[PDB]
């Protein structure tokens, strides 16, 4: 499947360039890999930026929160890039990049809404944490976040930049 | 198994050494990540030499194709897009997104820009207005023509697609 | 597993042999097209050998392979092994004039046995008639008539029809 | 698809060179076997350098988790334990079984001591009583307090789990 | 698992010019057998090739692909029946070189074809099998037609008397 | 999934003369364990071998194949119960060398055989288990036959008192 | 999964062939390849076959058996765990004096139960001839002993002539 480049597979040469890809649904296996790649890239140097490319519909909240906390834990600056879409938990990882270093390509779709075995109280505690993350990183008030997360829709990149999910939309070809 | 040739490469990696990217079968998030990774790698090898992009796909996920498209536009290199077999829905967008003068088809290919067949209607319509806009910029056609052409569930020949502006050259010769 | 000597198929590819075996689809077509384009770069003038044992498959996948055969400048030997049916017999007939061969016991079928609109299936079908007409030099009516009969023909009858040039009598 | 790092290692073997053991996903006999083998290997390389265990798990088989726990207590090394994402049921026992002073959580980890639900009833209760004694040893709560806390089907926050005695530090950033 | 001896055991046998035709025959098996036959001819057109047959038969047009390769190449082919060669497996056995077709004492031979395309097309293929067996067995088509409809296995001694085999190993 | 460490983690352990019997026992497991046991005897007939048991048991005739190899080879075998040794897993524990059978504190031992061939053939095979346990535990057949009837696990400190193992490695 | 040569390629270098699990045409193919290879390495050094098998396809087992009898090497056969049905024929087909079992092995010569009944019967009559030849029992004993659906101990299997040695170790 994966081509070889000169030998490496392409994803491991991207990792050698300090690029981490989060593609497709987030789960405890995807999180485990992303966590391991972030902890590794910190051990190789704690000063060079890391580049995280997001194309995901989101996924499990607990897996997404594990990736988030590690991005906040590691000392590296993190550039974060949206390609195609970043929805639900995927847009939290996008929002959680370093201020000034959060980017999107012009046609990406951003969704802050959190699409609909556990007690009701425990899902609500997770959501209350999400409101505080979005308020922290977007600098919106909690009242704005709660109503924004109620609308089941995708933002355009220009709407998401004025909302504060993005810093830059790179239209330059 | 993929045959090894001649260092020893599988042919898909040898073709990548010739700066050829293969987009084969349906487009999904896995294909999109592979195509974007291949494209970003080829830019690092040089910013100037063209990239060759061989399209044989029935299309696929719209947001996956837009991720490939956005990467094609970000990269500075000329991209030569070759239609082989067919390019339907999102596949004909990728064909059309090659650099002007470098979009080619073999003569028995079928081109379809109609989008055949989990999301709210408002977001599919927003996605579809993007397709109308980006076809118009790449084909140099009016939105009314695009809207009309994307409504007919039909394929068009490469000679028709050249007149419509999806293609630049049809290689009827060897 | 397949035996090592290279893998057995990579050893054959170094002899400029392309094995089309089994049903043809987009995954098979992409393999065959990749191999055909490579072998032209390795030398622009030495023949390529295509060995065909196929029941056919997707039409656009087969037409993708066929277009590559006509694009590259090399002669192509086509060898019918066991059977070449539907799109498999088009690839057999697409070999270079004088260089289309069959083993004595091969069965060839040009009929097309048995997501798309009816008008689009018929337009594809009319393309096949034009391909067979130019390569067999039969009239369009004979092609339409012979492709309607759900049958196989022997190599000696396929040679008389113009699908083949040589049958390799034992 | 697991990236390779350049000798060439997969990402998990590269981390094992940092003395990092990833206990991720559910625990079963093959997970237990793999963790125990890694712990015994890492002890051979140094009996006094710390080991780092990263935990994100919903729990698993109890006897498989107790096998891992017993290995953590056998080896002489300090074990720093990290909760990322969640540590539930048996995953919280491996968290609590880290070295005193070296059990850490990130701020959004979910901690559940409760045990959600093939053998006779007497064997489940006998496993339970072992768990109560292990938690009492490490959290320094009394058995009845553990029994009352372990009956509520809920998750603690990291700060609440520190007050319960499952954790020593909650870290936003490295100090 | 296949043992390693460096080669896996089947590639080590191929260096002895041994081709194992074992298990059911299909279009994928035919590809492997034909590629191995053409390779062994490239390494030498003179030295014999050894075919080891253990199969219940299979697809007719796949077995005919193997058969036509056996007759095309110039090498002598020793065919060995191991365990059984039924239906199309017994055609490859009979198509060995005259005097070089061998069997072990407990091999079971069956020329009958046990048990989509039109009826008329199966019958044309079937009539080809009669001609192939008649050529190699040195027997009347009427005898082949009668023998090929009996749903039975021959012993190696019966198969030698019929003309499918030349030699039976005695132990 | 298995990390590498010139090995994978398990071939590195095998170089320390450690054999792992993990998960259920079947014909595949029996063949692998017997091969490893015969290999380690060739490397030396004098150094101990370490066998780590975490098993729910499995096919009885597969476990007896492992057992007979343990008794054939000349090496001392240390047997370690980690987590659980039930049914056939407890026979491999009992069949370690005397003075060299160990358990971790939280292990579960079960001698009972949790519930094809004819009924008479299972009882024939069952009667061999009574003889094997009686040899190694030094209990009488009546004590073995009575103990095997209770569908229960037991703690290391009771299997030590029963004679299934010799040492419990209390945590420091 | 398989420890590291791999453990079986190392064992094959000691001239050990493992027959474990049920026998089918793919197992027969791999065992026959190993037997023919080991004869090429030398036609004089013994070969060791380890059997732990329920048996399986009869014609696959008969293909192995004829290969064991064709090659000139001595073959030492070891019953490990169980040898049932066709597994007991491979065991019995070891070299006289070199057919061994561990003490707790179970041996069964009964043949538990795509082709016609008359054809299965022709196969079973060959089985009677093989067992009578190798065990030196009469055909009437073999025919009766295959009818009883039972296992026997290695000591009882030695009295029947399927074994020569029991390794009290």
UniProtKB/Swiss-Prot annotation, chain C:
Q: Which tissues does the record link to its expression? A: Detected in liver (at protein level). Predominantly expressed in skeletal muscle. Intermediate levels in heart, liver and pancreas. Low in brain, placenta, lung and kidney.
Subcellular location, record wording: Mitochondrion matrix
Record keywords: Ribosomal protein included?
Answer: no
**Biological process (GO) annotations?**
membrane protein proteolysis; mitochondrial protein catabolic process; protein quality control for misfolded or incompletely synthesized proteins; proteolysis; proteolysis involved in protein catabolic process
Q: Which reaction does it catalyse?
A: Hydrolysis of proteins to small peptides in the presence of ATP and magnesium. alpha-casein is the usual test substrate. In the absence of ATP, only oligopeptides shorter than five residues are hydrolyzed (such as succinyl-Leu-Tyr-|-NHMec, and Leu-Tyr-Leu-|-Tyr-Trp, in which cleavage of the -Tyr-|-Leu- and -Tyr-|-Trp bonds also occurs)
| Record flagged with keyword Transferase | no
N6-acetyllysine modifications at? 134
**So where's the catalytic machinery, residue-wise?**
86 (nucleophile), 111
Please give the family membership noted in the entry. Belongs to the peptidase S14 family.
Tell me which disease this protein is linked to: Perrault syndrome 3: An autosomal recessive, sex-influenced disorder characterized by sensorineural deafness in both males and females, and ovarian dysgenesis in females. Affected females have primary amenorrhea, streak gonads, and infertility, whereas affected males show normal pubertal development and are fertile. A spectrum of additional clinical features, including cerebellar ataxia, learning disability, and peripheral neuropathy, have been described in some PRLTS3 affected individuals.
Instruction: Describe the subunit structure.
Output: Fourteen CLPP subunits assemble into 2 heptameric rings which stack back to back to give a disk-like structure with a central cavity. Component of the ClpXP complex formed by the assembly of two CLPP heptameric rings with two CLPX hexameric rings, giving rise to a symmetrical structure with two central CLPP rings flanked by a CLPX ring at either end of the complex.
UniProtKB/Swiss-Prot annotation, chain E:
GO MF, one term, reads: peptidase activity
Catalytic residues as annotated in Swiss-Prot or TrEMBL: 87 (nucleophile), 112
Reaction catalysis annotation: Hydrolysis of proteins to small peptides in the presence of ATP and magnesium. alpha-casein is the usual test substrate. In the absence of ATP, only oligopeptides shorter than five residues are hydrolyzed (such as succinyl-Leu-Tyr-|-NHMec, and Leu-Tyr-Leu-|-Tyr-Trp, in which cleavage of the -Tyr-|-Leu- and -Tyr-|-Trp bonds also occurs)
Annotated keywords: Acetylation, Deafness, Disease variant, Hydrolase, Mitochondrion, Protease, Serine protease, Transit peptide
Q: Where in the cell is it found?
A: Mitochondrion matrix
- Cellular component GO terms held in the UniProt record: endopeptidase Clp complex; mitochondrial matrix; mitochondrion
Q: What is its main location?
A: mitochondrion
Residue numbers of N6-acetyllysine PTMs: 135
Residues bearing the modification N6-succinyllysine: 124
Q: What is its EC number?
A: 3.4.21.92
What are the BP-aspect GO terms? membrane protein proteolysis; mitochondrial protein catabolic process; protein quality control for misfolded or incompletely synthesized proteins; proteolysis; proteolysis involved in protein catabolic process
**Keyword field contains Iron:** no
Using the UniProt record, name the top-level EC class of this enzyme in a single word.
Answer: hydrolase
The tissues where this chain's protein is expressed are given as: Detected in liver (at protein level). Predominantly expressed in skeletal muscle. Intermediate levels in heart, liver and pancreas. Low in brain, placenta, lung and kidney.
Summarize the impact of residue 87 to A/C: Abolishes protease activity
| Family, per entry | Belongs to the peptidase S14 family.
- How is this protein organized at the quaternary level? Fourteen CLPP subunits assemble into 2 heptameric rings which stack back to back to give a disk-like structure with a central cavity. Component of the ClpXP complex formed by the assembly of two CLPP heptameric rings with two CLPX hexameric rings, giving rise to a symmetrical structure with two central CLPP rings flanked by a CLPX ring at either end of the complex.
| Full protein name | ATP-dependent Clp protease proteolytic subunit, mitochondrial
Q: What is the lineage of its organism?
A: Eukaryota, Metazoa, Chordata, Craniata, Vertebrata
Gene name of the record:
CLPP
Q: Which residues of the full protein are shown?
A: 58 to 247 of 277
UniProtKB/Swiss-Prot annotation, chain G:
Which superkingdom, per the lineage? Eukaryota
State the top-level EC class. hydrolase
Task: State its Enzyme Commission number(s).
Answer: 3.4.21.92
Record keywords: Acetylation, Deafness, Disease variant, Hydrolase, Mitochondrion, Protease, Serine protease, Transit peptide
> N6-succinyllysine (modified residue): where?
122
Question: Which sequence ranges are marked TM in the entry?
Answer: none
Spell out the molecular function terms from Gene Ontology.
ATP-dependent peptidase activity; ATPase binding; endopeptidase activity; identical protein binding; peptidase activity; serine-type endopeptidase activity
Q: Which residues form the active site?
A: 85 (nucleophile), 110
Q: What is its main location?
A: mitochondrion
Instruction: Cite a single GO BP annotation.
Output: proteolysis involved in protein catabolic process
Tissue specificity annotation: Detected in liver (at protein level). Predominantly expressed in skeletal muscle. Intermediate levels in heart, liver and pancreas. Low in brain, placenta, lung and kidney.
N6-acetyllysine modified-residue sites:
133
Please write the reaction equations for the catalytic activity of this protein.
Answer: Hydrolysis of proteins to small peptides in the presence of ATP and magnesium. alpha-casein is the usual test substrate. In the absence of ATP, only oligopeptides shorter than five residues are hydrolyzed (such as succinyl-Leu-Tyr-|-NHMec, and Leu-Tyr-Leu-|-Tyr-Trp, in which cleavage of the -Tyr-|-Leu- and -Tyr-|-Trp bonds also occurs)
Q: Which GO terms describe its cellular component?
A: endopeptidase Clp complex; mitochondrial matrix; mitochondrion
| Location(s), subcellular | Mitochondrion matrix
Q: Does the keyword Hydrolase apply?
A: yes
Family to which this protein belongs:
Belongs to the peptidase S14 family.
Q: Tied to what disorder? A: Perrault syndrome 3: An autosomal recessive, sex-influenced disorder characterized by sensorineural deafness in both males and females, and ovarian dysgenesis in females. Affected females have primary amenorrhea, streak gonads, and infertility, whereas affected males show normal pubertal development and are fertile. A spectrum of additional clinical features, including cerebellar ataxia, learning disability, and peripheral neuropathy, have been described in some PRLTS3 affected individuals.
Q: What is this protein called?
A: ATP-dependent Clp protease proteolytic subunit, mitochondrial
**Included stretch of the parent chain:** 58 to 247 of 277
